[PDB]
Amino acid sequence: SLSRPRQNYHTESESAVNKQINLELYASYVYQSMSRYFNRDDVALKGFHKYFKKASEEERQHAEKLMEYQSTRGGRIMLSDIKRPENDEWGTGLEAMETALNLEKNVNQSLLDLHKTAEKHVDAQMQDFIEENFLREQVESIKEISDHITNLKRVGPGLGEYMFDKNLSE
Amino acid sequence: SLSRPRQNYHTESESAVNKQINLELYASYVYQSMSRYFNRDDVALKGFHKYFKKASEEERQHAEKLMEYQSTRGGRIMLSDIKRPENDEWGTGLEAMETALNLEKNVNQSLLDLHKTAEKHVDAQMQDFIEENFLREQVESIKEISDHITNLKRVGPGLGEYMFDKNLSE
Amino acid sequence: SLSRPRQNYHTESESAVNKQINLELYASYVYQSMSRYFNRDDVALKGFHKYFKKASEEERQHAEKLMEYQSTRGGRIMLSDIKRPENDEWGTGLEAMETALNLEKNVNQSLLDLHKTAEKHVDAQMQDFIEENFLREQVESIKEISDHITNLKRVGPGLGEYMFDKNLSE
Amino acid sequence: SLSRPRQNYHTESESAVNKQINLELYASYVYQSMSRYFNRDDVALKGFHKYFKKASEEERQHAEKLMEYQSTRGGRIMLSDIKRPENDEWGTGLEAMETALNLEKNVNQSLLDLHKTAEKHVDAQMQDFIEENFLREQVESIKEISDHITNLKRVGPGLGEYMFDKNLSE
Amino acid sequence: SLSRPRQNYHTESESAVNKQINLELYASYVYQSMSRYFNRDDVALKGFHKYFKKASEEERQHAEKLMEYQSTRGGRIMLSDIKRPENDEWGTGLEAMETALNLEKNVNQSLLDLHKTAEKHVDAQMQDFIEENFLREQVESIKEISDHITNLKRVGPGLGEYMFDKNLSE
Amino acid sequence: SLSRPRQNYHTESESAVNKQINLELYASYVYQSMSRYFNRDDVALKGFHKYFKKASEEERQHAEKLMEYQSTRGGRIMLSDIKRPENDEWGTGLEAMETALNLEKNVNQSLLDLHKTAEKHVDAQMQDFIEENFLREQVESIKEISDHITNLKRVGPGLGEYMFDKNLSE
Ligand SMILES: [Fe+2]
Ligand SMILES: [Fe+2]
Ligand SMILES: [Fe+2]
Ligand SMILES: [Fe+2]
Ligand SMILES: [Fe+2]
Ligand SMILES: [Fe+2]
Ligand SMILES: [Fe+2]
Ligand SMILES: [Fe+2]
Ligand SMILES: [Fe+2]
Ligand SMILES: [Fe+2]
Ligand SMILES: [Fe+2]
Ligand SMILES: [Fe+2]
Ligand SMILES: [Fe+2]
Ligand SMILES: [Fe+3]
């Protein structure tokens, strides 16, 4: 028996949503780790700390939006282990911004694949859901982090990193 | 000669819009009937009365939005009889929620087919109009009614129906 | 056996109430059709659009008042198909006001026959219900539409129609 | 050697965005010219002046939205000459509204071709961006101008044109 | 060499803080799973949904306070995989409250062991941190959950569960 | 036959006003290009972006002031192609400020020549119009840009540029 709300919602879409939930939880964990590292006494960049805290929270919210969507469509949420980040440490502000862009792009390609899944299965509603709730945000973020990387190179290490961080804080 | 505004609007889309206008007006009528049945002295469930009143109003508003859209694109509205509902009476609260779910699913499949019409004819604007104004709402409604059916089964007949109805009223 | 509330409510009155419900819903549909027609790109009279929208809504409200009354008295609402209007278009502002007057008079005569049903069966409460909630409004409406027809004749086609329509909008 | 933000953004799309930019800047210039013309001492229709001023501004805003989008995706803005309009004058209010409708339709077809480009390259983000920022507005404009042309024909020359112009002014 | 802030902070304390961070993240994930389960269409208990949402947020907050504390003392945060919960599905309200109590007791025993660690290494500040920020909250939660279980047993299944859930929603 | 308002308005002045309209439009387009260049991901100087956006808008406004003036005097606006800027990309902040100064001085010379036209033809009203609405502003912009170039040299590349851009933003 299909679940009562189930209508035009393929099993491959359902599976793919579960995968995407894990990815976003993972991304939130990476950002968490990045955030806490910048508040170490021997790193001490509170603007990077704050920027990656926000990132972490946003990723977790996106995972939760996917959880809700799964149940709304009549799919069943299947959770997996949230793997630990690749690194304990994250280097300079610039390095960590480069790390963040790579993660964002990874998550973006996963979202575009999830969109392609929905399209294949003629799931118009799921297409819209993804476009509105995920895709726009992702291209804004990629643009912003890329701007930050240009500026971190432009200011250089030492005082430059310190002044960039202050302006991240605001 | 086409109408002045007409641009990228197929006759099949135009026709399908008129069929959907009828469908939504029909659905409004069915909810009208349900609504008033629940205010009978020998039924007397004001929460269900209110819930199906709102449903009826919302289905008329969607028919009207489709009427407006037809003329905006340069289509011509063609109206047909609004058929009377299948029943005069609607049973218990649970029965009526099951009837509601079937109607919402039927309306949703028609919307999905209207979207496929728009897509076949490469009517991007129409696909967007349908996704934003119809498809989102329909999946919310399907989920809500499914929740209600679970809770009506969980409370049982009698006092349980009465208490659920109070909660619908708020 | 009779319904629990029922007292001094004849079967003929109950039947006639059902017929009146259909009539008013039909009237609402005619005014819906008129209203939309006036927002076509090749008609484009927003004052007439608004006027007939209001009319449509009012008719539906009166149908709904009769639905409620039927159940208040212990009668049973019996719905029928809502027939499609006799036309798809509606001509000039003047033509459509003439159409409206004929519809209002037809609905008035039905109301008056419904009152006579109530009087025949010595249903004083029904008579009072009909006078207060329907008859007064109908005389006012018939007068107003008559006034509009004199003015539409007085202004003439073209600019005059346009300026009448602006005043309808207000 | 792709730009840092670049992800799922075809060169075809990039170049089509540049062409659209030019087209909207052109359209803004046509509307500028029209707007000015209607404030000539020998034309003197301030409501048409204002209507085409607004249109000019909106077209420029949409060119600028496309400029911002190009850079957001990692594309590079390439500007071309903004060609001067086909005419120095613009005739009557009615003639100018006919001109405006032809311009809007032509901009709309370009937008629809831009959407087809995006679709062909499986650019889901781009599809959405065009739907929500461009396509909706364009169908509304086309309908409005079409309504204005009906009314300008209804009112006729002379006093009729003067009264329509007032109403445009508000 | 030790980190700059390091003073009176044992490696065993540092290690045990990392273990506790993992445990609280794990507990937050179990509560996440429970919370979403309760909003399934075929479960539909919004009060349990909300209760476990709040539980999940609080657990995450307590993990984050441990992260901050690790870095404040000069320790180094070490993250591990956050294991998926034991179940995908969580039964009745009553079953899930029993599950929650067993989780809270396990988290409390770990906190008490963490306090023993701090005491063995004569870390007065740590003891005070644990008492104030963790231990009080835990005994309250354990009391509250225990009260809920008594009440869930007292109301029984069906309507009783529904009414308890309303009261949780408040 | 002259236009009705025409008085003391030489054809050479009318011509020269059309040329100045084009110049200002061209200057607005140059600044628009400069503006959008500084928001590229690989340039990322939002203060410079803002500064040249304002410049672009101001130039447009001054073109439109000339447009209005032409029609006020009874002249006839004649539009020409707005040529595309000399460059696609505009170098560092300092380079672009040097570009801006040269543009400003070119536009100021044009204004001075337009004043000389008006003076030759004993057009006292025009001389004033130019002095008040154009000449004052242009010596302000020339002085401010000159100050900015001194400070861009003072601060140097890298962090200095970054900090000057922040101050531009404010
Ligand atoms: Fe995300
Ligand atoms: Fe993100
Ligand atoms: Fe609907
Ligand atoms: Fe609905
Ligand atoms: Fe009526
Ligand atoms: Fe009426
Ligand atoms: Fe446009
Ligand atoms: Fe969309
Ligand atoms: Fe437009
Ligand atoms: Fe905890
Ligand atoms: Fe807790
Ligand atoms: Fe200027
Ligand atoms: Fe200037
Ligand atoms: Fe009376």
Side-chain angles (χ1 to χ4, degrees), chain B residues 20-61:
Chain B
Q20 190 72 26
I21 291 164
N22 195 83
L23 183 58
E24 312 259 0
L25 293 170
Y26 173 77
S28 182
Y29 207 22
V30 174
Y31 286 134
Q32 177 83 89
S33 182
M34 305 195 85
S35 182
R36 298 296 166 186
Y37 166 79
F38 282 102
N39 214 21
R40 284 167 53 158
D41 74 270
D42 57 354
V43 179
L45 293 168
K46 287 184 175 289
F48 284 92
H49 168 68
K50 283 187 284 201
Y51 182 88
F52 292 127
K53 183 195 291 298
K54 179 178 172 279
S56 180
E57 292 293 313
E58 293 179 355
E59 279 291 342
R60 185 179 77 260
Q61 291 165 351

Coordinates of all heavy atoms in Angstrom, one line a residue, chain B residues 19-61, unseen atoms left out:
Chain B
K19 N -11.7 23.5 -18.8 CA -12.1 22.2 -18.1 C -11.7 22.3 -16.6 O -12.4 21.8 -15.7 CB -11.5 21.0 -18.7 CG -12.3 20.8 -20.1
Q20 N -10.6 22.9 -16.3 CA -10.1 23.1 -14.9 C -11.0 24.0 -14.2 O -11.4 23.8 -13.0 CB -8.6 23.5 -14.9 CG -8.1 23.4 -13.4 CD -7.8 22.0 -13.0 OE1 -7.6 21.1 -13.8 NE2 -8.0 21.7 -11.7
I21 N -11.4 25.1 -14.9 CA -12.4 26.1 -14.3 C -13.7 25.3 -13.9 O -14.1 25.4 -12.7 CB -12.8 27.2 -15.2 CG1 -11.6 28.1 -15.4 CG2 -14.0 27.9 -14.7 CD1 -11.6 29.1 -16.5
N22 N -14.2 24.5 -14.7 CA -15.4 23.7 -14.3 C -15.2 22.8 -13.1 O -16.1 22.6 -12.3 CB -16.0 23.0 -15.6 CG -17.4 22.4 -15.2 OD1 -18.5 23.2 -15.3 ND2 -17.5 21.3 -14.9
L23 N -14.0 22.0 -13.1 CA -13.6 21.1 -12.1 C -13.6 21.8 -10.8 O -14.1 21.3 -9.7 CB -12.4 20.4 -12.4 CG -11.9 19.4 -11.5 CD1 -13.0 18.3 -11.2 CD2 -10.6 18.7 -11.8
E24 N -13.0 23.0 -10.7 CA -12.9 23.7 -9.5 C -14.2 24.3 -9.0 O -14.4 24.3 -7.8 CB -11.8 24.8 -9.5 CG -10.5 24.4 -10.1 CD -9.4 24.1 -9.1 OE1 -9.5 24.2 -7.9 OE2 -8.3 23.8 -9.6
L25 N -15.0 24.8 -9.9 CA -16.4 25.1 -9.5 C -17.2 23.9 -9.0 O -17.9 24.1 -8.0 CB -17.1 25.8 -10.7 CG -16.6 27.1 -11.2 CD1 -17.2 27.5 -12.5 CD2 -16.8 28.2 -10.1
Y26 N -17.0 22.8 -9.6 CA -17.6 21.5 -9.1 C -17.2 21.2 -7.7 O -18.0 20.9 -6.8 CB -17.3 20.4 -10.1 CG -17.7 19.0 -9.6 CD1 -19.1 18.7 -9.6 CD2 -16.8 18.1 -9.0 CE1 -19.6 17.5 -9.1 CE2 -17.3 16.9 -8.5 CZ -18.6 16.5 -8.6 OH -19.0 15.3 -8.1
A27 N -15.9 21.3 -7.5 CA -15.3 20.9 -6.2 C -15.9 22.0 -5.2 O -16.1 21.5 -4.0 CB -13.7 21.0 -6.2
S28 N -16.0 23.2 -5.5 CA -16.5 24.2 -4.6 C -18.0 23.8 -4.2 O -18.3 23.9 -3.0 CB -16.5 25.6 -5.2 OG -17.0 26.5 -4.3
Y29 N -18.7 23.3 -5.2 CA -20.1 22.9 -4.9 C -20.2 21.7 -4.0 O -21.0 21.6 -3.1 CB -20.8 22.6 -6.3 CG -22.3 22.8 -6.3 CD1 -23.1 23.6 -5.5 CD2 -23.0 22.1 -7.3 CE1 -24.4 23.7 -5.6 CE2 -24.4 22.3 -7.4 CZ -25.1 23.1 -6.6 OH -26.4 23.2 -6.7
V30 N -19.3 20.7 -4.3 CA -19.2 19.6 -3.4 C -18.9 20.0 -1.9 O -19.6 19.6 -0.9 CB -18.2 18.5 -3.8 CG1 -18.0 17.4 -2.8 CG2 -18.5 18.0 -5.1
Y31 N -18.0 20.9 -1.8 CA -17.7 21.3 -0.4 C -18.8 22.2 0.2 O -19.0 22.1 1.5 CB -16.3 22.1 -0.4 CG -15.1 21.2 -0.5 CD1 -14.0 21.5 -1.3 CD2 -14.9 20.2 0.4 CE1 -12.9 20.7 -1.3 CE2 -13.8 19.4 0.4 CZ -12.8 19.7 -0.5 OH -11.6 18.9 -0.4
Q32 N -19.4 23.0 -0.6 CA -20.7 23.7 -0.2 C -21.6 22.7 0.4 O -22.2 22.9 1.6 CB -21.3 24.4 -1.4 CG -22.6 25.2 -1.1 CD -22.4 26.6 -0.5 OE1 -22.3 27.6 -1.1 NE2 -22.4 26.6 0.8
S33 N -21.9 21.6 -0.3 CA -22.9 20.6 0.1 C -22.5 20.0 1.5 O -23.3 19.8 2.4 CB -23.1 19.5 -1.0 OG -24.0 18.6 -0.5
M34 N -21.2 19.6 1.5 CA -20.7 19.0 2.8 C -20.9 20.0 3.9 O -21.3 19.6 5.0 CB -19.2 18.7 2.6 CG -18.9 17.8 1.4 SD -17.2 17.1 1.5 CE -17.5 15.6 2.5
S35 N -20.4 21.2 3.7 CA -20.5 22.2 4.7 C -21.9 22.3 5.3 O -22.1 22.4 6.5 CB -20.0 23.6 4.3 OG -20.1 24.6 5.3
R36 N -22.9 22.5 4.4 CA -24.2 22.7 4.9 C -24.7 21.5 5.6 O -25.4 21.5 6.6 CB -25.1 23.2 3.8 CG -24.7 24.4 3.1 CD -24.8 25.6 4.0 NE -24.1 26.7 3.3 CZ -23.9 27.9 3.9 NH1 -24.4 28.2 5.2 NH2 -23.1 28.8 3.3
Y37 N -24.4 20.3 5.1 CA -24.8 19.0 5.7 C -24.4 18.9 7.2 O -25.1 18.5 8.1 CB -24.2 17.8 4.9 CG -24.3 16.5 5.6 CD1 -25.4 15.7 5.7 CD2 -23.1 16.1 6.3 CE1 -25.4 14.6 6.4 CE2 -23.1 14.9 6.9 CZ -24.3 14.1 7.0 OH -24.2 12.9 7.8
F38 N -23.2 19.4 7.5 CA -22.7 19.4 8.9 C -23.4 20.4 9.8 O -23.2 20.3 11.0 CB -21.1 19.5 8.9 CG -20.5 18.1 8.6 CD1 -19.9 17.9 7.3 CD2 -20.5 17.1 9.5 CE1 -19.4 16.7 7.1 CE2 -20.0 15.9 9.2 CZ -19.4 15.7 8.0
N39 N -24.2 21.3 9.3 CA -24.9 22.2 10.1 C -26.4 21.7 10.3 O -27.3 22.5 10.8 CB -24.9 23.6 9.7 CG -25.0 24.6 10.8 OD1 -24.7 24.3 12.0 ND2 -25.4 25.8 10.5
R40 N -26.8 20.6 9.7 CA -28.1 20.0 9.9 C -28.3 19.8 11.4 O -27.3 19.4 12.1 CB -28.3 18.6 9.3 CG -28.5 18.8 7.8 CD -28.4 17.4 7.0 NE -29.2 16.3 7.6 CZ -29.6 15.3 7.0 NH1 -29.3 15.1 5.7 NH2 -30.3 14.3 7.6
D41 N -29.5 19.9 11.9 CA -29.8 19.7 13.3 C -29.4 18.3 13.8 O -29.1 18.1 15.0 CB -31.2 19.9 13.7 CG -32.1 18.9 13.2 OD1 -32.6 19.0 12.0 OD2 -32.4 17.9 14.0
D42 N -29.5 17.2 12.9 CA -29.3 15.9 13.2 C -27.8 15.4 12.9 O -27.5 14.2 13.0 CB -30.3 15.0 12.5 CG -30.2 15.1 11.0 OD1 -29.5 16.0 10.5 OD2 -30.9 14.2 10.4
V43 N -26.9 16.5 12.6 CA -25.5 16.2 12.4 C -24.8 17.1 13.4 O -24.1 16.6 14.3 CB -25.1 16.5 10.9 CG1 -23.6 16.3 10.8 CG2 -25.9 15.6 10.0
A44 N -24.9 18.5 13.3 CA -24.5 19.4 14.3 C -23.0 19.3 14.7 O -22.7 19.2 15.9 CB -25.5 19.3 15.5
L45 N -22.2 19.5 13.7 CA -20.7 19.5 13.9 C -20.2 20.8 13.3 O -19.8 20.9 12.0 CB -20.0 18.3 13.4 CG -20.4 17.0 14.0 CD1 -19.9 15.8 13.2 CD2 -19.6 17.0 15.4
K46 N -20.2 21.9 14.0 CA -19.8 23.2 13.5 C -18.4 23.4 13.0 O -18.1 24.2 12.2 CB -20.1 24.3 14.6 CG -21.7 24.4 14.6 CD -22.2 25.5 15.5 CE -23.7 25.7 15.4 NZ -24.3 26.3 14.0
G47 N -17.5 22.6 13.6 CA -16.1 22.5 13.1 C -15.9 22.0 11.7 O -15.3 22.7 10.9
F48 N -16.6 20.9 11.4 CA -16.6 20.4 10.1 C -17.4 21.4 9.1 O -17.0 21.6 8.0 CB -17.3 19.0 10.1 CG -16.4 17.9 10.6 CD1 -16.4 17.5 11.9 CD2 -15.5 17.2 9.7 CE1 -15.6 16.6 12.4 CE2 -14.7 16.2 10.2 CZ -14.8 15.9 11.5
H49 N -18.5 21.9 9.6 CA -19.2 23.0 8.8 C -18.2 24.1 8.4 O -18.2 24.5 7.2 CB -20.3 23.6 9.6 CG -21.0 24.8 9.1 ND1 -21.7 24.8 8.0 CD2 -21.0 26.0 9.6 CE1 -22.2 26.0 7.8 NE2 -21.7 26.8 8.7
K50 N -17.5 24.6 9.3 CA -16.5 25.7 9.1 C -15.4 25.3 8.1 O -14.9 26.0 7.2 CB -15.9 26.2 10.4 CG -17.0 27.1 11.0 CD -16.5 27.9 12.3 CE -16.4 26.9 13.5 NZ -16.4 27.5 14.8
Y51 N -14.9 24.0 8.3 CA -13.7 23.5 7.6 C -14.1 23.4 6.1 O -13.4 23.9 5.2 CB -13.3 22.2 8.2 CG -12.1 21.6 7.5 CD1 -10.8 22.0 7.9 CD2 -12.2 20.8 6.4 CE1 -9.7 21.5 7.3 CE2 -11.1 20.3 5.8 CZ -9.8 20.7 6.2 OH -8.7 20.2 5.6
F52 N -15.3 22.8 5.9 CA -15.7 22.7 4.5 C -16.3 24.0 3.8 O -16.1 24.2 2.6 CB -16.8 21.5 4.4 CG -16.2 20.1 4.6 CD1 -16.7 19.3 5.6 CD2 -15.0 19.8 4.0 CE1 -16.1 18.1 5.9 CE2 -14.4 18.5 4.4 CZ -15.0 17.7 5.2
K53 N -16.7 24.9 4.6 CA -17.0 26.2 4.1 C -15.8 26.9 3.6 O -15.8 27.5 2.5 CB -17.6 27.2 5.2 CG -18.0 28.6 4.8 CD -18.3 29.5 6.1 CE -19.5 29.1 6.8 NZ -20.8 29.2 6.1
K54 N -14.7 26.8 4.3 CA -13.4 27.4 3.9 C -13.0 26.7 2.6 O -12.6 27.4 1.7 CB -12.4 27.3 5.0 CG -11.0 27.8 4.7 CD -10.0 27.7 5.9 CE -8.5 28.0 5.6 NZ -7.7 26.9 4.9
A55 N -13.0 25.4 2.6 CA -12.7 24.6 1.4 C -13.4 25.0 0.2 O -12.9 25.3 -1.0 CB -12.7 23.1 1.6
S56 N -14.7 25.2 0.3 CA -15.6 25.7 -0.8 C -15.2 27.1 -1.3 O -15.1 27.3 -2.5 CB -17.1 25.7 -0.3 OG -17.9 26.1 -1.3
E57 N -14.9 28.0 -0.4 CA -14.5 29.3 -0.8 C -13.2 29.2 -1.5 O -13.0 29.9 -2.5 CB -14.3 30.2 0.4 CG -15.6 30.5 1.1 CD -16.5 31.4 0.3 OE1 -16.0 32.4 -0.3 OE2 -17.7 31.1 0.1
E58 N -12.2 28.4 -1.0 CA -10.9 28.4 -1.6 C -11.0 27.8 -3.1 O -10.3 28.3 -4.0 CB -10.0 27.6 -0.8 CG -9.6 28.3 0.4 CD -8.6 27.6 1.3 OE1 -8.3 26.4 1.0 OE2 -8.2 28.1 2.4
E59 N -11.9 26.8 -3.3 CA -12.0 26.2 -4.6 C -12.7 27.2 -5.6 O -12.3 27.2 -6.8 CB -12.8 24.9 -4.6 CG -12.0 23.7 -4.2 CD -10.9 23.3 -5.2 OE1 -11.0 23.6 -6.5 OE2 -10.0 22.6 -4.8
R60 N -13.6 28.0 -5.2 CA -14.2 29.1 -6.0 C -13.1 30.1 -6.3 O -13.0 30.6 -7.5 CB -15.4 29.8 -5.4 CG -16.1 30.8 -6.3 CD -17.4 31.5 -5.6 NE -16.9 32.5 -4.7 CZ -16.7 32.3 -3.3 NH1 -17.3 31.3 -2.7 NH2 -16.1 33.4 -2.7
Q61 N -12.2 30.4 -5.3 CA -11.2 31.4 -5.6 C -10.2 30.8 -6.7 O -9.7 31.6 -7.5 CB -10.5 31.8 -4.3 CG -11.3 32.6 -3.4 CD -10.8 32.7 -2.0 OE1 -9.9 32.0 -1.6 NE2 -11.5 33.4 -1.3

